[PDB]
Amino acid sequence: PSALTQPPSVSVSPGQTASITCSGDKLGNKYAYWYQQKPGQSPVLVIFQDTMRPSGIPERFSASNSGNTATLTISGTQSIDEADYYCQAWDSNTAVFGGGTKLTVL
Amino acid sequence: QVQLVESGGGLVQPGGSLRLSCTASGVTFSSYAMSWVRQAPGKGLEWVSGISGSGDSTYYADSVKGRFTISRDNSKNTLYLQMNSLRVEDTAVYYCATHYCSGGSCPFDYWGQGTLVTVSS
Amino acid sequence: ALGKLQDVVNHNAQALNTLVKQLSSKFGAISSVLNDILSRLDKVEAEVQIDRLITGRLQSLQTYVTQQLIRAAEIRASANLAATKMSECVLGQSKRVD
Amino acid sequence: STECSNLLLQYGSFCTQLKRALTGIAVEQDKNTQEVFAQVKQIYKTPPIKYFGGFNFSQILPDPSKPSKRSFIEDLLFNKVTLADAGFIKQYGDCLGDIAARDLICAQKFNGLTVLPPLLTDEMIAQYTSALLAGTITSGWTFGAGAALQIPFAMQMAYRFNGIGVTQNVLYENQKLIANQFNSAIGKIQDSLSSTASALGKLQDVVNHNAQALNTLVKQLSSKFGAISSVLNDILSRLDKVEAEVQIDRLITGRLQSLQTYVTQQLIRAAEIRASANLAATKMSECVLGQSKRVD
Amino acid sequence: CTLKSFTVEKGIYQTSNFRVQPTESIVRFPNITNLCPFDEVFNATRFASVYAWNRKRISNCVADYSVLYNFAPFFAFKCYGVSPTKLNDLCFTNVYADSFVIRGNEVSQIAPGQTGNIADYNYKLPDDFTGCVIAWNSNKLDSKVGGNYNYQYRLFRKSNLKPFERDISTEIYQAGNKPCNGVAGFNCYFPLRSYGFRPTYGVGHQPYRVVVLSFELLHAPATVCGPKKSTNLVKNKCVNFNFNGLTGTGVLTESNKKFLPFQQFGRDIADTTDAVRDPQTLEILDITPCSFGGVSVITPGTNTSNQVAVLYQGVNCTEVPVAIHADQLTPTWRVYSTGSNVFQTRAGCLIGAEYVNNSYECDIPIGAGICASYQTSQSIIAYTMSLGAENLVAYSNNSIAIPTNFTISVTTEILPVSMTKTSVDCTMYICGD
Amino acid sequence: LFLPFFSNVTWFHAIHVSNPVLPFNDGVYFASTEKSNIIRGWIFGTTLDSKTQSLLIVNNATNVVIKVCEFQFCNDPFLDVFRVYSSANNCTFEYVSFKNLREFVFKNIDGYFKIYSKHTPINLPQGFSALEPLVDLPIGINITRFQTLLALHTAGAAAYYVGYLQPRTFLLKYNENGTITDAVDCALDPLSETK
Ligand SMILES: *[C@@H]1O[C@H](CO)[C@@H](O)[C@H](O)[C@H]1NC(C)=O
Ligand SMILES: *[C@@H]1O[C@H](CO)[C@@H](O)[C@H](O)[C@H]1NC(C)=O
Ligand SMILES: *[C@@H]1O[C@H](CO)[C@@H](O)[C@H](O)[C@H]1NC(C)=O
Ligand SMILES: *[C@@H]1O[C@H](CO)[C@@H](O)[C@H](O)[C@H]1NC(C)=O
Ligand SMILES: *[C@@H]1O[C@H](CO)[C@@H](O)[C@H](O)[C@H]1NC(C)=O
Ligand SMILES: *[C@@H]1O[C@H](CO)[C@@H](O)[C@H](O)[C@H]1NC(C)=O
Ligand SMILES: *[C@@H]1O[C@H](CO)[C@@H](O)[C@H](O)[C@H]1NC(C)=O
Ligand SMILES: *[C@@H]1O[C@H](CO)[C@@H](O)[C@H](O)[C@H]1NC(C)=O
């Protein structure tokens, strides 16, 4: 919409399930996009159009967008998945991002 | 292999000017809409401006409106971000991202390495 | 000056001429002429084309008759008004304004 | 589709006579309006002095404040009937993107069905009604026969009382009572219009019947009529010429029948509307331009 | 030409609509490069029995159906809901190739709506089947001197199969009322019987190899497509377009409609496609008809002048088509917006008439209070119609106007009374003699 | 084939304190609120023997496996930590891929096994939540009976709902955003038929 609210951080042990959430006014009425940014690295798209993954993104990644929240779930969180995940949506030909969440892998 | 290379980033005094340039290789440049997005060290991602595929339509964020200007050359496969009146808040790493549309159905599938614009006295 | 009556005449004449001109429509058949269909095709094949022609010409006739009924209703309303005016304007003096 | 158009040419003059019938109906609507409202040889106007024997006409006389210059009661009536389509300009953009689906008018327009605007605008019809009203309240029934002959309104009321077999002294001796009763009755008309939202059910029914007819015509485009598909493009993309022609013929026959059904109901309804308009013109002549002895 | 006459009376006439024409053609098919494996369907060493018929899935490949004539010497396709020569222009979500062997006089049973032993107990096609049946004689491969008994069909079954249902069961069949106990008895038959395909048999008794291709032409994402090169995607222009076989003409714009992942097309009330997902970029696009509108021609009589004015009905003067060249706008005649005066009415854009501040009585009605006339140098003028002259009535509380004379007036009223009485000989009109 | 409105559905409670076959009819509506993951698939068939072909659907942490072999199913199939079946031969098809109401619809039309599903958070509620198509399987086999699999590692509980589809006519309301928000079961009562 205009403000994609996102938790600061999510702490997960290897093999657990991470659940990063993205909240916005009726976010379920728009497409949702998730990007993974690593330290000193460019952003990488992992979820587009709510629940679709680009080719090459591991099958463990999944997402949904219902109501006014969109969630990103990395099942079986590995050490590689430690990164800064972002949430994005479009509004009147302008891109709107969420604050970002660091997936701290234990 | 799609590759976006950025250039033109350096230290400027406040009130100065710049011109960022993003060059695409291994992709049809005219079939993509292009966009500039900035990330300050420690802060989040912010969409600065985006241009249509042919460049006929242009869109800017409010915090950057009037000041910045984005253009493209399809012959050179290059995207330009004319930067002027640079205020202190403009310090960020600037990425160029390709997307097929801006109507809501397309993601930023490819991102650049990122260029730094630091503005200070 | 008598445009109404001439218009009635012309509408009837144009309807009949339209009906005649509709006989050159193929309506999806190979020909609009029954004799050519019967001379070029054997019985079974000719029946399909003749059925197409029959349906088209039947529809043209029903269209004509429906417009005729509606126009006849309008004409009957005009005739009832004329009879009322004969009674109340010719056979008497009318108080009704206009 | 050009293939369908060439096939449709084989059906003769069905389309042209459908178009002729609809054009006749469209012309007849303007004729109906002219026959009802253009019954005055001049646009009559009252002087700024607005005293008529104590009778209050402010709520049916024009309001110069508003652009339409409609009366107060005419404003209420105008807001009681909501049009499906006024027939005015629809610029590109109203039927593009995500606005078209939420509007049936866009589908109608995209499938060749349009609404034409009346010849007389609402402002002109209000002008006619105000001319008739000024003629009546300043000259009685004289302007219906010849030149408008001014007469004080109380004396005109005395003429009317004579017209119903009551001596005029009854009017003159109860003039304030009679004027107050008229003012109260007009006030009740006002309050009833301001309360009841379906009082003008007849006119809204006309509007609704036309709108539903057009929407039915649009919805008939999804009928297969015995063909494999109701979409011409799919038939042309899936079958070669010879087989495609059979299915296109089926669709042409079905849609032709849909159009003829629509036009036939339009003709019959137009006849009913013409009868109503002739009655309205007779009532304008005999109730507004004069006093009627005809019971009820 | 609309009036079918060489003379036109004064009036306004509705002619053909204008229409912006497509500037180019767009083809958009999915990015698929693999060739479909039809060789191993038509070139198998042995085909399955019809009771145990084989089903193979074809997906994520490019299907050129013109190569099927090379793999097998059949005479022709027999297709349903599609023509064989249009297959290469289409896309399908999936294809299924069913293959088996029957005898020649049973080939008519491989068709929707059929009955018989094969259609009831071995292989059943749905009544709404869309696909093609390819059958060819295989006497040189499936016949032996002593007879070939490897090919079998189900002769007995308690009930008929459902469409596309397979039954490889071999339970003993009970024709009578006594139990069978897994033993072939008197009314207890083994359900399967073998063809005895011999080379000496007549044509109707000879083996035939059958391949049934079933697919879906309904709106859905597709992974099997014909040989068709994709062009680029053009937006904001009137184009011909082809999305996975769905053809049409219109303007393509970016859509905010939220398609679910299984949705490729969006349909409107008339069941016309007004939204499509791009098969390569996966973006959602809106489809709008290019540009159109009614045209009326305002003429005085051809006895008076050949000058005309043109009304573009219900249209902004800015959207009046200005498309250069004769292939981008029908009708091909042009009336210059600058050359002839342009006036905006609520009924549309009027070109060819000069608007004036005078008000006259209506001569040729345009609409929304505007009328046109041929007046003086004579030209077509447009104006607001006059309702009449104003007349302030000299009303007061004690003033009356009383006539001193009179006029005897005689006026005319014409009323139709009857119309032409007509009779039709229905048989003569319809059938002649 | 829809589940009729206000229809009588069965609320099963399966318990293992440390199981007859259900009919299939035209089709099945399956709802489960439990999140212990004990429910992990279904079986479908007619005899569920080696005499006929049967459909087996089993899901796990990151996959779902679907087969149409001739399973000799056990009397009480369940997943261990097989005991679902003893033998499996002649495989012809294979495929691999607040509270929470998980709803499913299975129907078997022509030779295609169609599955619809929907996960909706709940506070069987009283609103509308249309199910999305999930897969259709080109398996041509006859199904009259079905059963639910459980996953046993100990005390186990599993509650689920079963309703049956009937040939009906429904009037669906699509809102401006493309969502099915309302429906009318035309054969429910006189008022629905009028609607
Ligand atoms: C006439 O009617 C108007 C509107 O109802 C009202 O405001 C006004 O007071 C009335 N005048 C007299 C004299 O009754
Ligand atoms: C399906 O199986 C049941 C029970 O075995 C049987 O009664 C029915 O006839 C079968 N239907 C078909 C189409 O084979
Ligand atoms: C025609 O469109 C222009 C802008 O395109 C608009 O300003 C104008 O008001 C429109 N005219 C009418 C009569 O709607
Ligand atoms: C008509 O009125 C317009 C607008 O006031 C004015 O510009 C123009 O000169 C007038 N033309 C004539 C012929 O009076
Ligand atoms: C007419 O009468 C009204 C009220 O009786 C009065 O206000 C008005 O001034 C009178 N007009 C003339 C011209 O005497
Ligand atoms: C009445 O009119 C006639 C003809 O119009 C005229 O000759 C006659 O003088 C008029 N009478 C008076 C009294 O003016
Ligand atoms: C549902 O069916 C059972 C019997 O199978 C019956 O006892 C129960 O009353 C039914 N429910 C309703 C609401 O009628
Ligand atoms: C459709 O989506 C828009 C987008 O925000 C929203 O404003 C509107 O309320 C939605 N309509 C319904 C019926 O949910």
Author numbering:
A (entry chain L): 1 to 106
B (entry chain H): 1 to 121
C (entry chain A): 941 to 1038
D (entry chain C): 743 to 1038
E (entry chain A): 298 to 673, 686 to 742
F (entry chain C): 51 to 68, 78 to 140, 154 to 169, 183 to 208, 213 to 242, 256 to 297
Original paper wording:
The spike protein (S) is the site for binding of neutralizing antibodies and analysis of panels of human monoclonal antibodies (mAbs) generated from infected volunteers has shown that the majority of the most potent mAbs bind to the receptor binding domain (RBD) in subunit 1 (S1) of S. SD1 is a small domain present in the S1 subunit of spike, formed from residues 320–331 lying N-terminal to the RBD and 528–591, C-terminal to the RBD. In this study we report the generation of a panel of mAbs that have arisen from infection or vaccination, binding outside the NTD and RBD in sub-domain-1 (SD1), a highly conserved domain adjacent to the RBD. In all cases, the spike is in a three-RBD down conformation and is essentially threefold symmetric, with the Fabs contacting residues only from the SD1 domain. A triad of three charged residues, K535, E554, and E583, forms the key attachment point for all these anti-SD1 mAbs.
To determine the binding modes and details of the interaction of these potent neutralizing mAbs with S, we determined high-resolution cryo-EM structures of complexes of BA.4/5 spike with SD1-1 Fab and BA.2.12.1 spike with SD1-2 and SD1-3 Fabs. SD1-3 and SD1-4 (both isolated from the same donor) were highly related, showing only a single aa difference in the light chain, outside the CDRs, so we focussed our subsequent studies on SD1-1, SD1-2, and SD1-3. However, Fab SD1-3 is rotated clockwise by about 60° relative to SD1-1. Interestingly, the CDR-H3 of SD1-3 also contains a disulfide linking the fifth and tenth positions, which makes direct contacts with the triad. CDRs L1 and L2 interact with residues K557-F559, R577, and L582. In the structures, E554 is stabilized by a salt bridge to K535 of the K535, E554, and E583 triad, and has direct interactions with CDR-H3 of the three SD1 Fabs by either H-binding or salt-bridging. The E554K change will therefore disrupt interactions both within the triad and directly with all the SD1 mAbs. Mutations T323I, K529N, T547I, T547K, N556K, L560Q, A570D, A570V, T572I, T573I, and E583D had no effect on neutralization, however, mutation E554K led to complete knock out of activity of mAbs SD1-1, −2, and −3.
